[PDB]
Ligand binder design. Sequence first.
Ligand SMILES: *[C@@H]1O[C@H](CO)[C@@H](O)[C@H](O)[C@H]1NC(C)=O
Ligand SMILES: *[C@@H]1O[C@H](CO)[C@@H](O)[C@H](O)[C@H]1NC(C)=O
Lengths: 337, 43, 264, 48
Amino acid sequence: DPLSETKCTLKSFTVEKGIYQTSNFRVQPTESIVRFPNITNLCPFDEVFNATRFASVYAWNRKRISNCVADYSVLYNLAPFFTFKCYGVSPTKLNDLCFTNVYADSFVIRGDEVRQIAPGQTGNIADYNYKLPDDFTGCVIAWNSNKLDSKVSGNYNYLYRLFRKSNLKPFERDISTEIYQAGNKPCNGVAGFNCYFPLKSYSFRPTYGVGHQPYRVVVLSFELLHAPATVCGPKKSTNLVKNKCVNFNFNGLKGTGVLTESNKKFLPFQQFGRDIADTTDAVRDPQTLEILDITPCSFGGVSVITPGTNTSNQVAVLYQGVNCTEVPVAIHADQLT
Amino acid sequence: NKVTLADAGFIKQYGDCLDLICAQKFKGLTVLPPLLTDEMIAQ
Amino acid sequence: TTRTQLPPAYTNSFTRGVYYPDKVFRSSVLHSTQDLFLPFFSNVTWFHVISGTNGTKRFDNPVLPFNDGVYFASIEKSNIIRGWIFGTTLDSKTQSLLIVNNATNVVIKVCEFQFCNDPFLDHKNNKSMESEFRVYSSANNCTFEYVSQPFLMDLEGKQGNFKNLREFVFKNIDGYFKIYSKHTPIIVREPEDLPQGFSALEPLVDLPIGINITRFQTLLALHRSYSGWTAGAAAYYVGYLQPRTFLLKYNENGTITDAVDCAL
Amino acid sequence: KFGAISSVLNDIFSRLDPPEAEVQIDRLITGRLQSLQTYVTQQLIRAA
Ligand SMILES: *[C@@H]1O[C@H](CO)[C@@H](O)[C@H](O)[C@H]1NC(C)=O
Ligand SMILES: *[C@@H]1O[C@H](CO)[C@@H](O)[C@H](O)[C@H]1NC(C)=O
């Protein structure tokens, strides 16, 4: 009761006359609603990565993923090719998240230096051709080919990034070719000043039973959220609830508030609303178009008035800055305390 | 009239709150009304 | 033809080069943004597409490097300029883009084409499937296609006496292409300078292709002299973009009525 | 940002694992606490 709350907050068994601040009241959400875009087609992953010989190490191919529903439990359960070390992603929350413009790439490497050429760390191939940002949103997956995908007859297959003068521009291939340049002018015809071809030195034999394994790598790019999302996770969507402090999950924008009609003159491209204080007060439906307002439900402070413990135990409660009708005591269904 | 350019707001009943006081209020920044009113002060 | 060179000139840009930088709607707020924009009162080249030498084709399609952005504009009375070909070296070995206005579609063709020395089109369709597609003859490999309603909604069928004020900004970054267009009627017939007035360049469509472009080329439509290929008069403006810091003032309608930079 | 990854609690929670999200939230907590103590100190020095 208010007397017990005041005694607890005052750390005493006796309370003198006066008014005291104890805690605050708020309205808890009664339900949750999810509004998500509807996508019929399933997102192609096995047919875009699990395939024949991948792109060259120097010239890696980029595959694009958009307008699809992507599930990652299939790759989680699919066989060896383990690792999947997400730098800034929870590995179990990919399905929940709805992504934007996922870009797929094909890599081929030796495998003996995968640890050093791993993204986020400097390595031989990393300093040769491919550079990655300090923290890319995507995840790196190494496909450890054990027996079948390892070539045992072809001595070349896919070449190796043998040499490169310096690291290339960010997110660029290594189409660079021709002969090595010696210190005293570039050499001519190998025999001049020991020209070395900067590639073709993959050279793994079947007798090379101890030298690495094919470690094909895929890297994705996502997490923009400024534009409307394209690749959305496989989650159900339910009907929206208006004029209620409800848990909304509009296209991943999870939050609690009272949803009401909005008169905002949203331009056709504009998707999200905001206010002065960097708060999304409006939202656009990822379903049938409807501009919707966002407003958190009521809350305020609670003050306790007592005439003194010795005088009486009768107390009075003042609710701060709230109209009486909107917040009576007979609404104790989701109110605090 | 001269000083009423900036004020507390003259309303704290939240009924009109659905745009400056409300933005701060939604971040839990309240204003408590003074004990004495202008009528008493003028008296 | 054996046309001669022309000296490019410049004119004042006044208050131009404003587009919506963010998708979030806001009204009655003074937000400051840091992005690439046209500095106020900057030099802009204003190539005049006039019938060269009273009926001789001119090479008014310079190979202009793209750098970081463009401000292609038009004070054309009619529709004479179509084509915004981009390319690293403008050959069949480099992936190139083009924005045509054939019929009522844009045809955003992302492929490699062999390009003629002087690519041009015909404003009037040929009599009896027209031979206008002489800008390229061969196409090897194709990646992306986009067909939709034409990027020019302006019609001259109403009447004359009013020219167009088509405005365009082509922005490419980190494998994306954003277009911002806006048209207004013009009152004064003088084409020397753009009217002094604020304009907002609303985004139209985002293209996601990540082709590397180091040059810009435009095309013209010259159906027939009615010797050589020529048409009426035209004029377009070319201006580059650089990063800046700007302040925007959204109105009660939520639109940007004016903008103020922070370095002028 | 206060040196964090994101200023949104839901974003920093769903986009991060527990063992790093704890210090992620801690940094923002410390920054906002510094802001609050500075503000209340200014309030006192003005009430002076
Ligand atoms: C800018 O234009 C003015 C007038 O047209 C000219 O005098 C000046 O040389 C130009 N400067 C540049 C850098 O184009
Ligand atoms: C813009 O705001 C004005 C004044 O608030 C209003 O009269 C008008 O209807 C709004 N919309 C447009 C398109 O002008």
